[PDB]
Symmetry: C4
Subunit: 68 residues, 4 copies
């Protein structure tokens, strides 16, 4: 008897907790002295790149237009 609900609860807790934690690790890493002056790892540049990636995948699976 596979408990899909409990599996979903664990899955969600893990992925939400991981994303919230990784967002902080990304900010801390952006402040590291060995990437100062490296445009690729400037925090605003990273956030924009991540935003574009997430938005494009979301648009593939959950398009704003439900009748393309």
């Amino acid at each position: 008897a596979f408990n899909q609900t409990e599996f979903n609860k664990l899955l969600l807790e893990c992925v939400v907790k991981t994303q919230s934690s990784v967002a902080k690790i990304l900010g801390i890493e952006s402040l590291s002295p060995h990437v100062s002056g490296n445009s690729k790892f400037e925090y605003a540049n990273m956030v924009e790149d991540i935003r574009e990636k997430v938005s494009s995948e979301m648009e593939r699976f959950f398009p704003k237009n439900d009748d393309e």
Copy 2:
């Protein structure tokens, strides 16, 4: 013949292992000298912020009250 059970096993192993690993990486990063004195990255502050985020998403999908 898609093996949903084996897919679920891989998914769970990955997300649980990742979350357990990320929790440790977060602790190590909190101790980094370049974020000393930065309240945003103080470990207790980060943990509270993460806790609030996880709790709010869990309450959206798995509310304590099953008859709202």
Copy 3:
């Protein structure tokens, strides 16, 4: 028409890639000078703790005994 197969493919690629990457980040972070001599972040200690966590969750959902 929700493409569950393509969604599953993206989900798996992401979680497997993330776990493989996080395993390396964990190793690099274990070598950081600010956690030298901190038993909590000694690599073998971290790996054992992670292993116990993953094993216990896997045993909850996919027990070795299929007739408890």
Copy 4:
């Protein structure tokens, strides 16, 4: 009334955002001075190892040959 669609949306946003963020954290960590000259953590070596892992799991669940 469990909203599978909204759950899927949150799951996808989290895993895609996490993977995009972790890919950047991996690059920053590869540049860390304490792993200079350590072949295990050379960036190209890490990327190849990750690629092999992702490819093998993808081939297990979504084989290029649909009639083995």
